[PDB]
RNA sequence: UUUCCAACGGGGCCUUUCCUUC
């Protein structure tokens, strides 16, 4: 566990055995799919959507109430971003990492950290390349990635 | 990361009997875990095991008795040509008279005697005695 | 120890274990319905907050986040379900 | 300004073939976007007649 | 409105119950018009613990959405209006085969068309709005298999008597034994 | 030698079931 450090720490969400229900939940497939699409037009990521909707509204999970995961919804309604949002925060970080090495080159730990992050990015992409969510030949690079995330 | 789960069971098995326990909680099980334990409980080396359903891959509680010296798993599943079943029994089994090498053949998971009668061959899986 | 019923473990001991370490795992967080008597209808909230929740109309508060369960702000009521 | 153009004749033939792969790129992105848009009719039409026959084999048996 | 709701030519019970719906139909606005859109394909009759044979109604399964909205009120009038009978609502599902080697490629297969997923919707249909909160399977030292299907809490009254019919109902469909249980 | 007896394999049927196709 934890490829990129030594921590073995187990943490995660515990899914309820209940694949239907709350049943104290009312609403409807129409109600959330509209709450979903109305946030995803506001700029929110499929993670912050199920995040905000879980605490502010009742949504335990949007896959029990609606038959599809918060990403497949954004896709069929045409909100699906160019790059996955995991892969996006990675590239977004490496940018804020590399930006800091350019301003201070005397930090080697950073130079280390930048290696780990980039090592992750390139391997994630390589998967997304295999099942064709990214174009075969899609690659990360330091020049185009600063622009790519912004 | 977990590699052969068949072995992560037969291990929690071989650590219950020696420690003297009458039962164990094995995880995740499998189609093949079930069919190992089935050829096992069939010759009596264990009692009844009960598939519990987590919503993911499963657990099992196996009630075992006393009679099982070792139930082993052969990690590379070697190709056994039906001359070589003899040599697989002659190696890891305590005698000719009992004990069972359990392989996989096209005809499904079974012990090497039910192989010798049905006359099919295949990839070895493990053994029990 | 040396024989026990694993299939049918005590709910006393089962309630103490970790949420991954129960027989079939289940979450230990809950949901609740909160009131601010100024507003006549309730919002459903998640026991563990993160995002600091507000009710339907007015801008007030409900809870504030921490590591664990949401800390509800001052005079409030919570039914659980 | 770099090399890879050996003379006029090549530079043209490059340009010749660059506008040809920019059309095959345009024509395929218009025609397969005609495949998507116009199968969205056959979804709204076949979802209509199960919503039109939904009130039709309801109302007419009254 | 007699054989319309039948959705098939035969037979007798399918008529009787088809007649039974229409006797529950004209009660005017909320006791009809939400009961009319529903239909059923067929009915089968099989035995039960109470000596009262079971009446199992098949459903095309778009339609389990509305039937579930009624159900309890309906199966209360069906077991009353047709009594000495146990009335349950099953949904007809496809069950596609697992392709063989020598077999030639067909359209792929969804997993909800799979023999095992189907029998796991059968147990989900035979029981109703209580829930299924867990499962187990004992493999008896005889080599037998017996499925312990655990149920929930509230409203559970409605199937209380219906326990030993589902086991039989499901054993006429499948070839596998069922038992139930509740919390402690 | 059939009948009885169990035993061990083989094959084929029905159950929502390609074993391609006229
Ligand atoms: Mg770990
Ligand atoms: Mg590592
Ligand atoms: Mg964490
Ligand atoms: Mg495997
Ligand atoms: Mg183990
Ligand atoms: Mg399993
Ligand atoms: Mg023991
Ligand atoms: Zn408020």
């Amino acid at each position: 566990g934890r490829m990129h450090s030594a921590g073995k720490g187990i943490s995660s969400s515990a899914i309820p055995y209940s694949r239907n229900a709350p049943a104290w939940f009312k609403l409807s497939s129409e109600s959330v799919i509209e709450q979903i699409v109305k946030y995803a037009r506001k700029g929110l990521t499929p993670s912050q959507i199920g995040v905000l909707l879980r605490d502010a509204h009742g949504v335990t999970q949007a896959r029990v109430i609606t038959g599809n995961k918060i990403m497949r919804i954004l896709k069929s309604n045409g909100l699906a971003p160019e790059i996955p949002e995991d892969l996006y925060y990675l590239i977004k970080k490496a940018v804020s990492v590399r930006k800091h090495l350019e301003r201070n080159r005397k930090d080697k730990d950073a130079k280390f950290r930048l290696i780990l992050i980039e090592s992750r990015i390139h391997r994630l992409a390589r998967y997304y390349r295999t099942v064709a969510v990214l174009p075969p030949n899609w690659k990360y690079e330091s020049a185009t990635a600063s622009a790519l995330v912004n | 990361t977990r590699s052969s789960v068949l072995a992560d069971a037969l291990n929690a098995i071989n650590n219950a009997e020696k420690t003297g326990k009458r039962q164990v909680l094995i995880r995740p099980s499998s189609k093949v875990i079930i069919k190992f334990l089935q050829v096992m409980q069939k010759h009596g080396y264990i009692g009844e095991f009960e598939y519990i359903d987590d919503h993911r891959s499963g657990k099992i509680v196996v009630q075992l008795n006393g009679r099982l010296n070792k139930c082993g798993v052969i990690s590379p599943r070697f190709n056994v040509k039906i001359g070589d079943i003899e040599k697989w029994t002659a190696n890891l089994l305590p005698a000719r008279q009992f004990g069972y090498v359990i392989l996989t053949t096209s005809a499904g998971i079974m012990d090497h005697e039910e192989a010798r009668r049905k006359h099919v061959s295949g990839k070895i899986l493990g053994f029990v005695y | 120890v040396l024989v026990q019923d694993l299939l049918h473990p005590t709910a006393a001991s089962e309630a103490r274990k970790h949420k991954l370490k129960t027989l079939v795992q289940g979450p230990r967080s809950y949901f609740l319905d909160v009131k601010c008597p100024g507003c006549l209808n309730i919002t459903t909230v998640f026991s563990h907050a993160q995002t600091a929740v507000t009710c339907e109309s007015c801008s007030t508060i409900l809870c504030t986040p921490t590591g664990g369960k949401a800390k509800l702000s001052e005079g409030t009521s919570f039914r659980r379900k | 300004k770099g090399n890879a153009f050996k003379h006029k004749r090549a530079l043209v033939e490059h340009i010749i073939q660059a506008k040809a792969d920019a059309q095959r790129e345009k024509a395929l992105n218009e025609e397969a976007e005609a495949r998507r848009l116009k199968n969205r009719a056959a979804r709204d039409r076949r979802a209509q007649r199960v919503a039109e026959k939904r009130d039709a084999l309801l109302k007419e048996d009254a | 409105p007699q054989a319309k709701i039948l959705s098939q030519a035969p037979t007798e019970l399918e008529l009787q119950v088809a007649q039974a719906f229409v006797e529950l139909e004209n009660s005017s606005p909320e006791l009809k018009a939400e009961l009319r859109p529903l239909q059923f394909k067929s009915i089968r009759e099989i035995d039960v613990a109470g000596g009262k044979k079971a009446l199992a109604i098949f459903v095309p399964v778009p339609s389990l959405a509305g039937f579930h909205k009624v159900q309890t009120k309906l199966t209360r009038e069906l077991e009353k209006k047709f009594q000495d009978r146990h009335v349950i609502f099953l949904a007809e599902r496809r069950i596609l085969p697992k392709p063989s080697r020598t077999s030639r490629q067909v359209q792929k297969r969804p997993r909800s068309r799979t023999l095992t997923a189907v029998h796991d919707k059968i147990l989900e249909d035979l029981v109703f709005p209580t829930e299924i909160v867990g499962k187990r399977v004992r493999y008896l030292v005889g080599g037998n298999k017996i499925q312990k299907v655990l149920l929930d809490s509230k409203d559970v009254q409605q199937i209380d008597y219906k326990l030993e019919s589902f086991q039989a109902v499901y054993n006429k469909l499948t070839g596998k034994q069922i038992v139930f249980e509740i919390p402690s």
Side-chain angles (χ1 to χ4, degrees):
Chain A
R2 228 70 43 247
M3 69 165 79
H4 262 150
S5 44
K8 232 61 68 186
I10 57 188
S11 218
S12 89
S13 295
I15 238 185
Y17 193 88
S18 164
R19 288 164 154 183
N20 32 39
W24 64 258
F25 181 67
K26 8 81 244 303
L27 284 166
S28 43
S29 312
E30 161 211 355
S31 292
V32 312
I33 283 184
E34 197 222 82
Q35 272 322 313
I36 291 170
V37 179
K38 179 85 288 295
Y39 285 122
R41 225 143 251 168
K42 200 164 178 284
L44 279 265
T45 73
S47 291
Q48 310 151 328
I49 280 152
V51 152
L52 179 55
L53 291 174
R54 117 231 235 171
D55 6 273
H57 308 12
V59 203
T60 79
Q61 334 197 247
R63 191 259 206 94
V64 188
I65 178 55
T66 26
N68 309 313
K69 295 198 189 100
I70 303 184
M71 202 44 187
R72 283 180 175 125
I73 298 180
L74 268 72
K75 183 266 313 177
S76 308
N77 291 321
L79 279 300
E82 36 186 354
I83 42 171
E85 72 157 296
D86 45 33
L87 224 225
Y88 165 94
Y89 277 96
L90 277 180
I91 306 174
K92 198 131 156 298
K93 175 149 283 258
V95 172
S96 203
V97 179
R98 172 179 301 267
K99 184 175 179 186
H100 170 66
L101 229 186
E102 314 240 14
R103 298 177 297 182
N104 325 88
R105 322 188 184 290
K106 211 67 198 282
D107 181 324
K108 311 295 289 274
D109 177 78
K111 206 178 179 175
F112 191 43
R113 280 323 176 294
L114 223 215
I115 301 155
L116 297 193
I117 299 145
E118 297 212 2
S119 308
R120 257 175 276 141
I121 295 167
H122 293 106
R123 304 164 65 195
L124 212 216
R126 165 143 54 100
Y127 164 70
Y128 283 155
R129 192 139 22 77
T130 316
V131 299
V133 351
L134 284 167
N137 88 14
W138 194 92
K139 194 201 282 282
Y140 166 101
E141 34 214 27
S142 337
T144 75
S146 181
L148 201 178
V149 97
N150 321 304
Chain B
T1 59
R2 215 168 311 237
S3 310
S4 196
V5 175
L6 202 216
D8 271 350
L10 310 178
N11 165 256
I13 279 187
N14 266 86
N15 275 306
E17 274 254 283
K18 298 175 185 173
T19 30
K21 278 64 157 40
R22 295 328 225 89
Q23 16 52 257
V24 65
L25 196 178
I26 98 197
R27 185 163 58 86
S29 81
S30 88
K31 290 179 303 177
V32 201
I33 295 220
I34 300 304
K35 277 237 180 310
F36 210 97
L37 305 174
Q38 276 190 343
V39 194
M40 267 204 308
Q41 146 196 275
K42 167 162 134 185
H43 298 93
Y45 294 85
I46 45 141
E48 85 160 58
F49 55 99
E50 181 170 343
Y51 168 94
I52 124 165
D53 198 277
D54 53 49
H55 252 345
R56 302 81 171 143
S57 300
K59 311 187 172 183
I60 304 181
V61 183
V62 187
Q63 315 281 341
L64 39 288
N65 39 41
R67 335 158 184 281
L68 183 47
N69 305 267
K70 169 173 277 194
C71 66
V73 56
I74 303 305
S75 126
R77 305 262 171 83
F78 290 104
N79 291 291
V80 202
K81 287 202 148 154
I82 240 176
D84 294 332
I85 38 94
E86 268 146 299
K87 304 213 297 183
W88 272 97
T89 61
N91 280 24
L92 80 207
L93 284 186
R96 334 188 71 212
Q97 7 263 9
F98 69 104
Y100 289 101
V101 173
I102 164 264
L103 46 270
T104 341
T105 80
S106 51
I109 297 186
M110 48 130 163
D111 61 81
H112 78 270
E113 257 158 54
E114 203 188 297
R116 207 84 196 104
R117 301 184 248 95
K118 285 231 242 179
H119 199 273
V120 232
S121 217
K123 306 184 127 72
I124 183 189
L125 257 176
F127 59 114
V128 50
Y129 53 64
Chain C
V1 45
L2 244 251
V3 51
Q4 50 175 329
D5 209 11
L6 287 167
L7 285 144
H8 312 107
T10 86
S13 60
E14 201 93 349
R16 84 166 73 186
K17 275 162 135 71
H18 183 272
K19 125 248 282 274
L20 288 192
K21 308 201 157 180
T22 73
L23 179 56
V24 179
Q25 47 159 295
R28 307 283 181 103
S29 24
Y30 48 92
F31 281 96
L32 30 73
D33 314 34
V34 195
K35 315 196 180 186
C36 45
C39 278
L40 318 181
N41 276 69
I42 61 195
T43 54
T44 325
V45 197
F46 183 39
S47 49
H48 294 243
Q50 298 166 37
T51 64
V53 193
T54 36
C55 196
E56 153 91 317
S57 55
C58 74
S59 327
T60 167
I61 188 54
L62 278 175
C63 50
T64 56
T66 43
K69 304 177 181 175
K71 156 77 55 189
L72 303 91
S73 170
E74 213 222 12
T76 31
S77 24
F78 46 94
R79 199 190 258 243
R80 162 207 288 261
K81 251 160 194 172
Chain D
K1 148 131 148 155
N3 246 48
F5 301 114
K6 196 204 192 86
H7 22 90
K8 197 140 82 61
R9 175 183 62 178
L11 202 207
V12 157
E13 297 177 21
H14 203 243
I15 305 181
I16 261 179
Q17 255 265 14
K19 278 157 35 76
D21 299 35
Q23 214 169 355
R24 271 163 283 177
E25 209 61 72
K26 227 200 202 67
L28 267 54
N29 269 50
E30 298 177 1
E31 75 160 348
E33 193 255 290
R35 303 305 304 263
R36 312 148 32 189
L37 257 286
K38 131 182 287 183
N39 180 268
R40 288 225 193 89
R43 194 151 320 174
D44 296 23
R45 291 141 169 194
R46 263 201 213 94
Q48 238 31 250
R49 324 282 169 72
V50 198
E52 296 175 63
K53 191 254 274 296
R54 166 189 169 198
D55 320 42
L57 286 185
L58 272 226
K59 177 186 166 186
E60 293 163 352
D61 291 333
Chain E
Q2 290 255 345
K4 284 166 166 290
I5 219 165
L6 231 169
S7 182
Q8 174 73 295
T11 165
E12 309 117 15
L13 280 171
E14 306 184 18
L15 288 175
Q16 310 236 294
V17 186
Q19 197 162 239
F21 267 90
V22 201
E23 192 258 282
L24 323 173
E25 249 211 332
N26 341 303
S27 311
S28 278
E30 314 95 348
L31 320 172
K32 204 192 50 62
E34 9 236 316
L35 234 189
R36 68 190 326 269
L38 311 149
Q39 207 193 43
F40 79 98
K41 316 179 67 170
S42 55
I43 263 271
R44 299 197 178 196
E45 189 187 45
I46 40 178
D47 320 295
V48 169
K52 335 170 109 75
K53 304 180 158 216
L55 280 181
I57 340 204
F58 293 168
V59 180
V61 218
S63 38
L64 274 209
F67 267 156
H68 286 9
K69 294 154 187 171
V70 187
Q71 211 69 198
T72 91
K73 325 203 62 181
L74 238 180
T75 80
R76 251 155 190 178
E77 238 64 14
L78 289 189
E79 283 185 309
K80 183 176 54 187
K81 292 292 186 176
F82 211 140
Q83 201 147 102
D84 241 62
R85 283 299 176 256
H86 270 198
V87 157
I88 212 56
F89 286 95
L90 300 175
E92 182 97 63
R93 298 193 175 78
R94 262 270 75 109
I95 301 190
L96 271 159
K98 173 188 169 196
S100 117
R101 325 280 217 189
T102 282
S103 110
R104 278 167 38 161
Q105 198 163 20
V106 207
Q107 174 128 83
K108 187 144 174 289
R109 193 149 145 244
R111 201 71 110 265
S112 63
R113 236 120 298 185
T114 211
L115 185 283
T116 57
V118 152
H119 299 356
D120 281 324
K121 266 308 186 283
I122 291 185
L123 279 347
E124 240 164 303
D125 292 11
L126 271 187
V127 154
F128 209 160
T130 65
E131 222 179 32
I132 322 198
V133 205
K135 298 183 199 187
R136 329 273 125 105
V137 178
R138 316 212 329 276
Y139 298 63
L140 300 221
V141 253
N144 314 76
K145 315 209 316 196
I146 295 154
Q147 195 165 341
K148 230 182 274 180
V149 191
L150 327 182
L151 303 204
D152 169 35
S153 195
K154 338 151 173 182
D155 287 323
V156 138
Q157 274 72 54
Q158 314 183 39
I159 41 188
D160 260 52
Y161 53 109
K162 303 210 184 192
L163 264 47
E164 224 157 34
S165 13
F166 301 145
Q167 316 179 297
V169 163
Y170 183 81
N171 204 113
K172 218 109 179 198
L173 302 180
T174 68
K176 316 169 187 179
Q177 307 275 129
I178 248 64
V179 181
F180 302 68
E181 211 207 294
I182 17 261
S184 203

